[PDB]
Design a binder for this molecule. Structure first.
Ligand SMILES: *[C@@H]1O[C@H](CO)[C@@H](O[C@@H]2O[C@H](CO)[C@@H](O[C@@H]3O[C@H](CO[C@H]4O[C@H](CO)[C@@H](O)[C@H](O)[C@@H]4O)[C@@H](O)[C@H](O[C@H]4O[C@H](CO)[C@@H](O)[C@H](O)[C@@H]4O)[C@@H]3O)[C@H](O)[C@H]2NC(C)=O)[C@H](O)[C@H]1NC(C)=O
Ligand SMILES: *[C@@H]1O[C@H](CO)[C@@H](O[C@@H]2O[C@H](CO)[C@@H](O[C@@H]3O[C@H](CO[C@H]4O[C@H](CO)[C@@H](O)[C@H](O)[C@@H]4O)[C@@H](O)[C@H](O[C@H]4O[C@H](CO)[C@@H](O)[C@H](O)[C@@H]4O)[C@@H]3O)[C@H](O)[C@H]2NC(C)=O)[C@H](O)[C@H]1NC(C)=O
Ligand SMILES: COc1ccc(C(=O)O)cc1S(=O)(=O)Nc1ccc(C(F)(F)F)cc1N1CCCCC1
Ligand SMILES: *[C@@H]1O[C@H](CO)[C@@H](O[C@@H]2O[C@H](CO)[C@@H](O)[C@H](O)[C@H]2NC(C)=O)[C@H](O)[C@H]1NC(C)=O
Ligand SMILES: *[C@@H]1O[C@H](CO)[C@@H](O[C@@H]2O[C@H](CO)[C@@H](O)[C@H](O)[C@H]2NC(C)=O)[C@H](O)[C@H]1NC(C)=O
Ligand SMILES: *[C@@H]1O[C@H](CO)[C@@H](O)[C@H](O)[C@H]1NC(C)=O
Ligand SMILES: *[C@@H]1O[C@H](CO)[C@@H](O)[C@H](O)[C@H]1NC(C)=O
Ligand SMILES: *[C@@H]1O[C@H](CO)[C@@H](O)[C@H](O)[C@H]1NC(C)=O
Ligand SMILES: *[C@@H]1O[C@H](CO)[C@@H](O)[C@H](O)[C@H]1NC(C)=O
Ligand SMILES: N[C@@H](CCCC[NH3+])C(=O)O
Ligand SMILES: N[C@@H](CCCC[NH3+])C(=O)O
Ligand SMILES: [Zn+2]
Length: 883
């Protein structure tokens, strides 16, 4: 039924490749030219034929195939010369067909040889070109690969599905001014007649096609050896070698931990980490050659803050964990992508907390779960395991549900089974499926070895969307436990609520503590309703200890009153993470209609005595978001009352903040948040100090030691004048620090001149001074402010076709460009314009799940204002009289 490009019929119909021909070994030779910006290449694929067939089906996209032969040492019909193969192209499924002269014999091995060529990509996928700037002002070119999920077919024809694992022998031809890096160590370099060089790399272990990598560049490196003898090297552009020191130290510690914790050595001799100047994701876990964004790998003590230090440590730990969860053990199909991303996201918590406990990443992990709850509490969410077929649908699987929710339900399972039993389970899981593939049921069986308990439990957490809501009622010593599906913007008395609660049931591993006993008590909630008996008549009971469970708790009667009373009288009687969860769940239930906003704002009164930075920053984030929500809607009477309440009720902790980098990680993050909040509210002492620091910095004409914790704040104030704004843009182009450029670009986005904001968008589109990889984050930073809100929304609508040429439809950049310019809307006027814009894109044949997610988010903001805006106005006005 499918027709090929030459008019003939295509002998294959399905998007999935046939299983009759299995690849065993790839011989891959690539000859890129960094002057003509193209390449020629050839390959020889050793395949095993299990079923007699007249054709071979392979993936190939945007590749010109010139030769195609089939040889065999076991089938004499295809001896040493071979037989020519006729190729048929079917771009709709990104497949090609290799028609053989005589049907292949089962159980015999063959060799598929092909010559192919194409230009270097101009985007971020496949084998594409990237540029960087030297300290002297030179621009250099490199060639780099990025294949996950389905872009290996853009560089070489292959069975581009993760189940078709095979060995890879890679050879790269290059000039003497370049080096060549790949997955495996370089075995030898041969000099060619014309003066070129050809690097031969060791044959890889069994691995999926999306992990193949090769780079041609002129980077420098710093090297070190782990305890197991693995040579770790950090690669970066030559003028940035000093910024690779921390990456090497962290990689050595983290790789050693992963080897001991997983009880499985890293199987390769070397592991390279390279900072790519043009890179779309944070990083990519190519086996033995992990590619990074410069902000994800490089660290400069002069311009990188402690939160940047935490960020680099997270990404390195994330990609090194992938060497086991991802490279060693891969999912069968992208429907279970969370087996890689969820575990790698989870192992961040275990590895960073064990290797760098001073970073206090354990407290920051709650933000990972709270972030995905925002999208999981909407109906437009999805189960973490969901079928996916098209390349766009596969790209949509890389979201907060696979990453964040996967890590959070794994942390919940760890707390239910215990660290020792959980660690033993994943060790058996990794050893059982080494160099093979696994699905969800494989993981549940490995963690089972009570058995049917964890499989039936985790089934409801992976095949059902959303997050459950635990409702607790307390009378005397009796506890009535009820579970519902937590919905945002949908009240219980709404007609849609009944239709959204049916056939939703979770096996929730409940954990609770009381005021009489701090001992943790556990109970598995399997049904819709259950009862529990308490030993003593306690004053309160706090469920979900430390928020280890992926569920929200609501208390009926005086439940919240008892807990809020406890916070105002003796807040240290509640665990520090219990306070974080309480502050979080209270404001979530206000949006759910189970609590009025004044009850939530009453809890924030105790924050005057809160010294635990996680809880303090959590409560401040809601008050800060409320202010910006009013500011964007020009509700000046509420925003002014919120500004005065913040600057007055939290004046003690604000005034005692220094403009330095002293203290622990959370001390420095508390400083940056408080001083950013104060300066955003135009607090005169904050503005006077920040403008003084920027003045001295600019008057120095160079870089004086400005504390990194206040670096983003100082630059933001300096960008409020055209003189300082022009100087920052000049400093941006000359900066050798990607972290500083990140902070500088944020400062330029805080300008109130629309001509300056449009210039940044134009520069981001041009991609020369401001790289296009920062366009999505730049549009978001401009849109979240009142002066740039309309500009960004207008730009996305008017230049949609131009944006779709820079990124793929399913790319994460397009997702943030759409969401980052629309999600913060909260008026029916904007909801209509967004609804019409999405409908026009649907007419053009572009469908994304982010469309309904944005629409539901905007409706939630509308209904949140309709239900709580007068309460917020009244509570603030009552506060001006309570003083
Ligand atoms: C990516 O693509 C680029 C562009 O195509 C390649 O760069 C060019 O590579 C070619 C081939 O290496 C270079 O051309 C050669 O230059 C040599 C140096 O020339 C000097 O010496 C001669 C006398 O010997 C003088 O006349 C000349 O003015 C210079 O002073 C020449 O010696 C070579 O000539 C010989 O080779 C050619 C082969 O085609 C013969 O036809 C000639 O008759 C002669 O025998 C040759 O001209 C060229 O200079 C490069 N360009 C640049 C800008 O550097 C990359 O090599 C390629 N990279 C990869 C990895 O593919
Ligand atoms: C494609 O990639 C796969 C990997 O996925 C390769 O398979 C490996 O092949 C090598 C060489 O044939 C094997 O290396 C040998 O390993 C032995 C121990 O292996 C055990 O332990 C590991 C630990 O993880 C298990 O994974 C494994 O299944 C075994 O249980 C060593 O004892 C060997 O060293 C000794 O033997 C050789 C040969 O006699 C001597 O020369 C040495 O000096 C030494 O005395 C050897 O190192 C490896 O085990 C295989 N791995 C797997 C997972 O099967 C393919 O070879 C590769 N294909 C191509 C064409 O490159
Ligand atoms: C492979 O990548 C990651 C590895 C590990 C982690 C981990 O959990 O530590 C996360 C990512 S990520 O891809 O999720 N990273 C990200 C997310 C959101 C944003 C946003 F701008 F929307 F806020 C930006 C980024 N990065 C960081 C700097 C800007 C460039 C991309
Ligand atoms: C973060 O790391 C710390 C330090 O190892 C962990 O605390 C240890 O936990 C084990 C098991 O519960 C105890 O046997 C140790 O005595 C603890 N040590 C200390 C210093 O407290 C902590 O559990 C880790 N956090 C997570 C979430 O895994
Ligand atoms: C909430 O989400 C569910 C699941 O996506 C929706 O149920 C499906 O909705 C689509 C389109 O509305 C229908 O084509 C399907 O037949 C529905 N399936 C079922 C089993 O109901 C539901 O409509 C959504 N509700 C709201 C209010 O958006
Ligand atoms: C391959 O051959 C086996 C041999 O029994 C058969 O069961 C299977 O259906 C065949 N599959 C295809 C796709 O021909
Ligand atoms: C890198 O660090 C060394 C260490 O002494 C120093 O000499 C050199 O000037 C530094 N270079 C850059 C570009 O920071
Ligand atoms: C909070 O609890 C501690 C622990 O008993 C106690 O020492 C402290 O006085 C309490 N705070 C107040 C304000 O009572
Ligand atoms: C905000 O409202 C005031 C009062 O109606 C008006 O003068 C001002 O122009 C408005 N500004 C914006 C940005 O909407
Ligand atoms: N697997 C990568 C993401 C690849 C995204 C490719 N567009 C990770 O660790 O998150
Ligand atoms: N620290 C990163 C930003 C991380 C964004 C997290 N959502 C940077 O330098 O840009
Ligand atoms: Zn990942």
């Amino acid at each position: 039924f499918p027709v090929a490009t030459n008019g003939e019929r295509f002998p294959w119909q399905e998007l999935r490749l046939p299983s009759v021909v299995i690849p065993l070994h790839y011989d891959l030779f690539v000859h890129p030219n960094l002057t003509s910006l193209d390449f020629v290449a050839s390959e020889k694929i050793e395949v095993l034929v299990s079923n007699a067939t007249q054709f071979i089906i392979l993936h190939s996209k945007d590749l010109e195939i010139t030769n195609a032969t089939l040889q065999s040492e076991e089938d004499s019909r295809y001896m040493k010369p071979g037989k020519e193969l006729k190729v048929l192209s079917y771009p709709a499924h990104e497949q090609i067909a290799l028609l053989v002269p005589e049907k292949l014999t089962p159980h015999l091995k063959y060799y598929v040889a092909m010559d192919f060529q194409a230009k270097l990509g101009d985007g971020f996928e496949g084998f594409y070109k990237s540029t960087y700037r030297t300290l002297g002002g030179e621009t250099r070119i490199l060639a780099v690969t990025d294949f996950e999920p389905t872009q290996a077919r853009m560089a070489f024809p292959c069975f581009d599905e993760p189940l078709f694992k095979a060995n890879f022998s890679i050879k790269i031809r290059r000039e003497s001014r370049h080096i060549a890096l790949s997955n495996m160590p370089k075995v030898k370099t041969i000099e060619l007649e014309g003066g070129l060089l050809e690097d031969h790399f060791e044959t890889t272990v069994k691995m999926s096609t999306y992990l193949v990598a090769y780079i041609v560049c002129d980077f420098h490196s710093l090297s070190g050896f782990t305890s197991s003898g693995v040579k770790v090297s950090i690669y970066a552009s030559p003028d940035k070698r000093n910024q690779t020191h921390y990456a090497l130290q962290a990689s050595l510690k983290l790789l050693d931990f992963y080897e001991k914790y997983f009880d499985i050595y890293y199987p390769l001799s070397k592991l390279d980490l390279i900072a790519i100047p043009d890179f779309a994701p944070g990083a990519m876990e190519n086996w033995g050659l992990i590619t990074y964004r410069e902000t994800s790998l490089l660290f400069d003590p002069k311009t990188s803050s402690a939160s940047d230090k935490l960020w680099v440590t997270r990404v390195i730990a994330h990609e090194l964990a992938h060497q086991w969860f991802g490279n060693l053990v891969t999912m069968e199909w992208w429907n279970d992508i969370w087996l890689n991303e969820g575990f790698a996201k989870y192992m961040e918590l275990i590895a960073v907390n064990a290797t760098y406990p001073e970073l206090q990443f354990d407290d920051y992990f709650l933000n990972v779960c709270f972030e995905v709850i925002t999208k999981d509490s909407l109906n437009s969410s999805r189960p973490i395991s969901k079928p996916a077929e098209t390349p766009t649908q596969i790209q949509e699987m890389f979201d907060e549900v696979s990453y964040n929710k996967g890590a959070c339900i794994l942390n919940m399972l760890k707390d239910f089974l215990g660290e020792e039993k959980f660690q033993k389970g994943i060790i058996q899981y990794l050893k059982k499926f080494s160099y093979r593939n696994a699905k969800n049921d494989d993981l549940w069986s490995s963690l089972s070895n009570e058995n049917a308990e964890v499989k039936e439990m985790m089934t409801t957490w992976t095949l059902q969307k959303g997050i459950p809501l635990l409702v607790v009622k307390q009378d005397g010593c009796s506890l009535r436990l009820q579970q519902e599906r937590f919905l945002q913007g949908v009240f219980q008395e709404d007609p849609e609520w009944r239709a959204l609660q049916e056939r939703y049931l979770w096996h929730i591993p409940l954990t609770y503590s009381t005021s009489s006993s701090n001992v943790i008590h556990r109970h598995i909630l399997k049904s819709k309703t259950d009862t529990l008996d308490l030993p003593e008549k306690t004053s309160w009971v706090k469920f979900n200890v430390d928020s280890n469970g992926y569920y929200i708790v609501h208390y009926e009667g005086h439940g919240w009153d008892q807990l809020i009373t406890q916070l105002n009288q003796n807040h240290t009687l509640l665990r520090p993470k219990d306070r974080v969860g309480l502050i979080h769940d209270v404001f979530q239930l206000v949006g759910a209609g189970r609590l009025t906003l004044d009850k939530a704002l009453d809890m924030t009164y105790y924050l005057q005595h809160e010294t635990s930075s996680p809880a303090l920053l959590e409560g401040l984030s809601y008050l800060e978001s409320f202010y910006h929500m009013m500011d964007r809607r020009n509700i000046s009477d509420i925003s002014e009352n919120l500004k005065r309440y913040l600057l007055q009720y939290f004046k003690p902790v604000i005034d005692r903040q220094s403009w330095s980098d002293k203290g622990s990680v959370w001390d420095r993050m508390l400083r940056s948040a408080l001083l950013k909040l104060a300066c955003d509210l135009n607090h005169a002492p904050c503005i006077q100090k920040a403008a003084e620091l920027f003045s001295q910095w600019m008057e120095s004409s160079g870089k004086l030691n400005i504390p990194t914790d206040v670096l983003k704040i100082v630059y933001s104030v300096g960008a409020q004048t055209t003189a300082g704004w022009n100087y920052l843009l000049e400093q941006y182009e000359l900066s050798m620090s990607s972290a500083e450029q990140n902070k500088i670009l944020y400062a330029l986005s805080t300008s109130k001149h629309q001509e300056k904001l449009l210039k940044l968008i134009e520069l981001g589109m041009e991609g020369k001074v401001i790289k296009t990889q920062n366009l999505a984050a730049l549009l978001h930073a401009i849109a979240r402010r009142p002066k740039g809100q309309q500009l960004a929304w207008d730009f996305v609508r008017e230049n949609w076709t131009h944006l779709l040429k820079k990124f793929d439809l399913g790319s994460y950049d397009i997702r943030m460009i759409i969401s980052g310019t629309t999600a913060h809307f909260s008026s029916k006027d904007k909801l209509q314009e967004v609804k019409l814009f999405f409908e026009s894109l649907e007419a053009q044949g572009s469908h994304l799940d982010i469309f309904q997610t944005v629409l539901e988010t905007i409706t939630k903001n509308i209904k949140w204002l309709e239900k709580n805006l007068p309460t917020l106005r009244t509570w603030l006005m009552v506060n001006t009289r309570h003083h």
